[PDB]
């Protein structure tokens, strides 16, 4: 068979930087290699084919190079829109194999930005259901790495919360995170102080947003 290995797999760079992604094949594939760009929740768009030839309608900053076993995808000066997962594909085998790479996730790097934090008590309509879900919102921050610590009467909660992160905003290149703390109605009314503690590179010390049940 044939295996296509990409390097690096994750990569961050600031607007204006030069970007370089590497592909390698287990056998020589002389120039039967293509590159695809796939943005989150969208279809892959072809960038380069025949290892050097730019697809019609693609910016000139995308360049293709290499032949044999090692190939290279290059972005001359990174644009805010260019955060995506780039794949190299082999078209050298007979019969077809269409081997892909694992992909290189490319994020846009910027100045660190502290997150705005909000907290949402459960809706009284949801309390009708016998369930209480508290939400902590972290808005428009960078970098992606943050920490949300749920506290119920200063008792650190674990195992009853999940969180999701948005992809990078296309213009300001920030992230957003929403963590949900889920409790039963009975367990929710036992306590009074519900807080989420946020630790982030952009904050001198952890921010804590809190409310008291019964306001």
């Amino acid at each position: 068979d044939i295996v296509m290995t990409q390097s690096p797999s994750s990569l961050s760079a600031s607007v204006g930087d030069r970007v370089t992604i590497t592909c390698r094949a287990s056998q020589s594939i002389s120039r039967y290699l293509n590159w695809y760009q796939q943005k989150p929740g969208k279809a892959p768009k072809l960038l380069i084919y025949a290892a050097s030839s730019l697809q019609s309608g693609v910016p000139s900053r995308f360049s293709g190079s290499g032949s044999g076993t090692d190939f290279t995808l290059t972005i001359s000066s990174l644009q805010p829109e260019d955060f995506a997962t780039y794949y190299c594909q082999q078209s050298y085998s007979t019969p077809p194999e269409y081997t892909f790479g694992q992909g290189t996730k490319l994020e846009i790097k910027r100045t660190v930005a502290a997150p705005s934090v909000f907290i949402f008590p459960p809706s009284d309509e949801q309390l009708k259901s016998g369930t209480a879900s508290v939400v902590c919102l972290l808005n428009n921050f960078y970098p992606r790495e943050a920490k949300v610590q749920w506290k119920v009467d200063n008792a650190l909660q674990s195992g009853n919360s999940q969180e999701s992160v948005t992809e990078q905003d296309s213009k300001d290149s920030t992230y957003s995170l929403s963590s949900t703390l889920t409790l039963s109605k009975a367990d929710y009314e036992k306590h009074k102080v519900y807080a989420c503690e946020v630790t982030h590179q952009g904050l001198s010390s952890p921010v804590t947003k809190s409310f008291n049940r019964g306001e």
């Binding site: 056998q27 020589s28 594939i29 002389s30 044999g68 050298y92 085998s93 007979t94």
Partner: peptide, 11 residues
């Protein structure tokens, strides 16, 4: 086709 002397034996 484009045969070159160090193409893989398959090519």
């Amino acid at each position: 086709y484009g045969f070159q002397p160090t193409n893989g034996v398959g090519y």
